[PDB]
Amino acid sequence: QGIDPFTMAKILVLYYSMYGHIETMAHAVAEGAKKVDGAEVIIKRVPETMPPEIFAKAGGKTQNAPVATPQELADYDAIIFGTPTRFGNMSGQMRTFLDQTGGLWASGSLYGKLGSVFSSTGTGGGQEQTITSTWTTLAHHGMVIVPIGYAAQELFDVSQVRGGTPYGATTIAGGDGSRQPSQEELSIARYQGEYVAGLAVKLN
Amino acid sequence: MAKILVLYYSMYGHIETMAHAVAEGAKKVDGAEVIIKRVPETMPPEIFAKAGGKTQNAPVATPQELADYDAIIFGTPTRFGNMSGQMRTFLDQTGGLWASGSLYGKLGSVFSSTGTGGGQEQTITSTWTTLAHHGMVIVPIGYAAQELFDVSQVRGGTPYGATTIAGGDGSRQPSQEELSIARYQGEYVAGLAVKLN
Amino acid sequence: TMAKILVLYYSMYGHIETMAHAVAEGAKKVDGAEVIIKRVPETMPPEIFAKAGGKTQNAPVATPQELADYDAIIFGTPTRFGNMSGQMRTFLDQTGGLWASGSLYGKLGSVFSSTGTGGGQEQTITSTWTTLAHHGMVIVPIGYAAQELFDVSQVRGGTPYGATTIAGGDGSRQPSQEELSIARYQGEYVAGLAVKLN
Amino acid sequence: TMAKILVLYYSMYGHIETMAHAVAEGAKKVDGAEVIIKRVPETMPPEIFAKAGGKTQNAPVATPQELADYDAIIFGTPTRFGNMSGQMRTFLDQTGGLWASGSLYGKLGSVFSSTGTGGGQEQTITSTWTTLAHHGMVIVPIGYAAQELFDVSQVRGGTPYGATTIAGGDGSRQPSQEELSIARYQGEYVAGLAVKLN
Ligand SMILES: Cc1cc2nc3c(=O)[nH]c(=O)nc-3n(C[C@H](O)[C@H](O)[C@H](O)COP(=O)(O)O)c2cc1C
Ligand SMILES: Cc1cc2nc3c(=O)[nH]c(=O)nc-3n(C[C@H](O)[C@H](O)[C@H](O)COP(=O)(O)O)c2cc1C
Ligand SMILES: Cc1cc2nc3c(=O)[nH]c(=O)nc-3n(C[C@H](O)[C@H](O)[C@H](O)COP(=O)(O)O)c2cc1C
Ligand SMILES: Cc1cc2nc3c(=O)[nH]c(=O)nc-3n(C[C@H](O)[C@H](O)[C@H](O)COP(=O)(O)O)c2cc1C
Ligand SMILES: Nc1cc(Br)cc(Br)c1O
Ligand SMILES: Nc1cc(Br)cc(Br)c1O
Ligand SMILES: Nc1cc(Br)cc(Br)c1O
Ligand SMILES: Nc1cc(Br)cc(Br)c1O
Numbered sequence: 001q002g003i004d005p006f007t008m009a010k011i012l013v014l015y016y017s018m019y020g021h022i023e024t025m026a027h028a029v030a031e032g033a034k035k036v037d038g039a040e041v042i043i044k045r046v047p048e049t050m051p052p053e054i055f056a057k058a059g060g061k062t063q064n065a066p067v068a069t070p071q072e073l074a075d076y077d078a079i080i081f082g083t084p085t086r087f088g089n090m091s092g093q094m095r096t097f098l099d100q101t102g103g104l105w106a107s108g109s110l111y112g113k114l115g116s117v118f119s120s121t122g123t124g125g126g127q128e129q130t131i132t133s134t135w136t137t138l139a140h141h142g143m144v145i146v147p148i149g150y151a152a153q154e155l156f157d158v159s160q161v162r163g164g165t166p167y168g169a170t171t172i173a174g175g176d177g178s179r180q181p182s183q184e185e186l187s188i189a190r191y192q193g194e195y196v197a198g199l200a201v202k203l204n
Numbered sequence: 205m206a207k208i209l210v211l212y213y214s215m216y217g218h219i220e221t222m223a224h225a226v227a228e229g230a231k232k233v234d235g236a237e238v239i240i241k242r243v244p245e246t247m248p249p250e251i252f253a254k255a256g257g258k259t260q261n262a263p264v265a266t267p268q269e270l271a272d273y274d275a276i277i278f279g280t281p282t283r284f285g286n287m288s289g290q291m292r293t294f295l296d297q298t299g300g301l302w303a304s305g306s307l308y309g310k311l312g313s314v315f316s317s318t319g320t321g322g323g324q325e326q327t328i329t330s331t332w333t334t335l336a337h338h339g340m341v342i343v344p345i346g347y348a349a350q351e352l353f354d355v356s357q358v359r360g361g362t363p364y365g366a367t368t369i370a371g372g373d374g375s376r377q378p379s380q381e382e383l384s385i386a387r388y389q390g391e392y393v394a395g396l397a398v399k400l401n
Numbered sequence: 402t403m404a405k406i407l408v409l410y411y412s413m414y415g416h417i418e419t420m421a422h423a424v425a426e427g428a429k430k431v432d433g434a435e436v437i438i439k440r441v442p443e444t445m446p447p448e449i450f451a452k453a454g455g456k457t458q459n460a461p462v463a464t465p466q467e468l469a470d471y472d473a474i475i476f477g478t479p480t481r482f483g484n485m486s487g488q489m490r491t492f493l494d495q496t497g498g499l500w501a502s503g504s505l506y507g508k509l510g511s512v513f514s515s516t517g518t519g520g521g522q523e524q525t526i527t528s529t530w531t532t533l534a535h536h537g538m539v540i541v542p543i544g545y546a547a548q549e550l551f552d553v554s555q556v557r558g559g560t561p562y563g564a565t566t567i568a569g570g571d572g573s574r575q576p577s578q579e580e581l582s583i584a585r586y587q588g589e590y591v592a593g594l595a596v597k598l599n
Numbered sequence: 600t601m602a603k604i605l606v607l608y609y610s611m612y613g614h615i616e617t618m619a620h621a622v623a624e625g626a627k628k629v630d631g632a633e634v635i636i637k638r639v640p641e642t643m644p645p646e647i648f649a650k651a652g653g654k655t656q657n658a659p660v661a662t663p664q665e666l667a668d669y670d671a672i673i674f675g676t677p678t679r680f681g682n683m684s685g686q687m688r689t690f691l692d693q694t695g696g697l698w699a700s701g702s703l704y705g706k707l708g709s710v711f712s713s714t715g716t717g718g719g720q721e722q723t724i725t726s727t728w729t730t731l732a733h734h735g736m737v738i739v740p741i742g743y744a745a746q747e748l749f750d751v752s753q754v755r756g757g758t759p760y761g762a763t764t765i766a767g768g769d770g771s772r773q774p775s776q777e778e779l780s781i782a783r784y785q786g787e788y789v790a791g792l793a794v795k796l797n
Pocket of ligand 5: 101102103105106140284318319320322371372373
């Protein structure tokens with residue numbers, strides 16, 4: 001072949017988002033990952049599970065990213081998972097999708113690849129538990145779990161409300177969803193993307 | 205005098221069997237009214253048939269009715285160390301209950317199942333997180349169940365809640381020891397529900 | 402008279418201690434609740450604690466054995482990289498005797514924490530819950546009864562898992578009225594539950 | 600030598616100690632991996648160590664400061680009610696200096712544990728991961744590469760989160776061939792990743 005000699009690592013940013021907050025974060029993660037020379041980055045969402053009429057009546061945000069299949073997760077060197085919280089877990093849509101990776105699991109297709117997580121909540125509560133409980137699933141697949149620690153200097157500033165934890169980037173949407181991701185939350189997300197992507201390139 | 209819901213998800217019947225022992229234990233408590241209900245299957249029916257999903261007798265619960273009980277005992281098989289998507293999808297539809305505080309202060313407790321043991325604890329504790337967001341009182345079982353001191357044989361069950369080991373191929377049935385722990389969990393939670401009423 | 406509540410804490414620079422007093426004040430609003438505050442023993446040498454500027458504290462030091470004398474224990478700890486502090490862990494490491502005799506079984510347990518920057522405040526509470534579970538304690542989260550948990554206009558601790566406070570990177574931040582109010586609710590709620598169960 | 604691996608453990612009755620040697624043995628299979636086993640200092644007074652009958656240990660004692668000298672650290676600890684041991688917690692509580700200078704950032708971390716009767720072996724590993732995360736370490740689970748994890752015909756430790764052993768309530772179980780083999784894999788896997796990252 002010789003098809004694509006310049007790509008060094010492939011990064012999938014896979015997310016679920018209903019009102020677009022994770023969607024916004026996923027784009028910042030991808031922007032950070034694209035800063036690594038040789039990192040090929042693609043954004044994909046998991047399929048919606050609620051009936052289309054019920055997504056419409058709820059005002060769900062239509063999204064441009066392609067819908068991911070479970071099988072193609074095996075094509076990537078690193079997967080960065082984004083999900084809103086549902087009472088301190090990942091969303092049902094993300095859970096249902098990951099529940100379909102059993103074929104990958106049985107063949108060890110995700111073993112040793114890099115995994116990393118970012119989340120969103122309305123009022124903050126559960127933002128850590130959501131990431132940490134997602135790591136468990138990465139572990140069963142044998143993925144290397146990449147936290148972000150305190151490299152992002154924004155994390156030392158507690159003068160304002162802001163998402164972002166050493167476990168991964170987060171954003172706070174507000175109870176009514178009106179809060180948009182801040183520059184500092186987006187800067188943490190970008191760091192997570194670039195950090196993971198650099199690691200994927202180093203491992204290849 | 206007290207009402208116990210045993211709410212479960214099951215594909216191959218292992219959780220279903222545990223749920224019946226949990227309910228059996230809960231029925232030993234005078235004044236406890238106990239009912240078993242399942243979470244709705246979410247996968248397409250042709251795929252459940254092809255996968256050999258087990259036909260089950262219990263009626264399906266709706267999300268709104270969780271508020272009618274004094275204690276809810278949640279059963280779920282593990283999916284990579286979480287509750288199943290089916291259980292997650294159902295609990296994701298309890299937001300109305302959450303906003304009105306309808307589950308607040310009620311007793312919640314959890315039991316699980318795995319193929320080879322791994323993840324059985326993470327499944328229970330990560331479910332507890334959701335119970336906490338609803339403000340439910342979280343009931344572990346500790347070491348009241350004496351089977352938990354015996355490590356001479358393969359046996360599910362943890363201080364966090366009852367568990368069973370199905371085997372990689374699903375062929376293992378819940379043992380007498382695992383069912384006894386599940387029964388204990390049911391009886392303990394129900395007695396607590398009666399005392400609080 | 403009707404229920405005995407222990408507010409058991411560890412504190413280095415006084416933030417948890419301040420939270421502990423608010424937790425106890427909340428529990429004291431329940432008629433019939435006897436509430437006492439105690440701390441776990443310091444583990445670092447006294448001279449090194451002084452050089453680090455540790456806060457001197459009046460509460461009596463608890464012993465492991467006396468935990469069995471209470472109906473509900475509300476545990477306070479600062480975070481150490483997302484767990485309970487070494488001091489608290491060392492203390493709970495001495496409760497195996499209570500574990501072997503089921504002395505804490507079925508009692509109410511509840512947790513509140515403190516961090517410099519928020520990160521880890523949830524993991525600290527939840528990983529403490531694990532220890533309470535091994536003792537068979539009934540775990541009491543607070544959910545969202547405290548309306549202060551809905552206001553994201555200002556930095557403030559408190560989670561559905563239990564009350565928390567944000568000390569700041571340099572520890573100069575004091576617990577806010579909203580953080581104390583969430584702590585007060587936690588105390589009152591747990592104390593109310595202990596009374597109902599007796 | 601291409602990478603330096605620290606196997607850092609705490610052990611009271613020798614179970615983690617046995618496991619730690621198998622972990623190191625696995626890591627020494629990787630060409631260029633320099634592997635050393637070290638223990639965290641005991642915290643209880645010697646008179647109480649004697650009455651509890653603690654098993655004396657030959658491995659050198661580690662300092663908090665030297666953790667920055669390694670490319671990968673594999674932490675072993677017995678469980679205490681579903682957390683890491685107080686001794687391990689106390690030791691890691693003194694890595695605050697390492698934290699402020701980012702000295703452990705990006706290094707590989709991995710965990711193995713021990714219990715009497717199984718319960719808590721997973722919570723001990725995952726709650727240890729939290730601390731590694733605050734330090735910005737890369738967290739290495741083992742997944743299901745070790746075939747022994749599919750065999751449920753006999754009592755056996757080991758999880759996708761890390762190797763474990765079951766000592767028995769009275770400590771009479773010694774780590775089995777299968778559990779040590781999982782531990783050997785963990786060491787070999789981590790060491791290979793450490794070499795690749797250098
Ligand atoms: C079922 C359900 C449970 C929720 N649980 C929480 C929660 O525990 N904590 C929280 O802050 N927000 C919670 N929310 C608020 C959602 O997290 C919020 O709308 C979401 O993060 C928005 O992200 P998105 O635009 O990417 O969908 C919940 C929402 C629903 C619908
Ligand atoms: C998507 C998927 C993920 C699974 N993850 C795990 C696991 O992490 N650990 C495990 O021991 N078994 C796992 N299994 C085995 C299941 O838990 C097992 O079939 C189940 O507990 C049977 O319970 P049931 O009869 O009620 O369905 C998994 C199965 C599926 C389909
Ligand atoms: C060893 C150590 C580890 C710490 N880890 C964290 C942390 O993970 N997250 C955080 O926000 N603060 C952390 N801090 C900040 C302390 O948690 C903070 O000073 C404490 O909550 C103050 O409470 P106190 O006055 O009751 O001691 C840590 C401090 C030390 C000494
Ligand atoms: C304070 C204390 C707490 C313990 N908690 C647990 C536990 O939660 N689960 C368990 O199986 N064993 C528990 N045990 C049994 C210990 O983990 C067990 O003896 C240990 O793993 C042996 O490892 P070692 O020889 O390396 O010390 C506990 C023992 C003590 C002293
Ligand atoms: N039996 C089984 C099946 C899947 Br898919 C994942 C795991 Br982990 C299992 O143990
Ligand atoms: N939007 C929203 C929904 C639920 Br359910 C819980 C919380 Br907290 C939220 O902020
Ligand atoms: N062996 C053992 C000792 C204590 Br103390 C607690 C537990 Br839980 C145990 O398994
Ligand atoms: N303030 C603070 C101090 C240490 Br040491 C660790 C963390 Br993480 C913190 O947030």
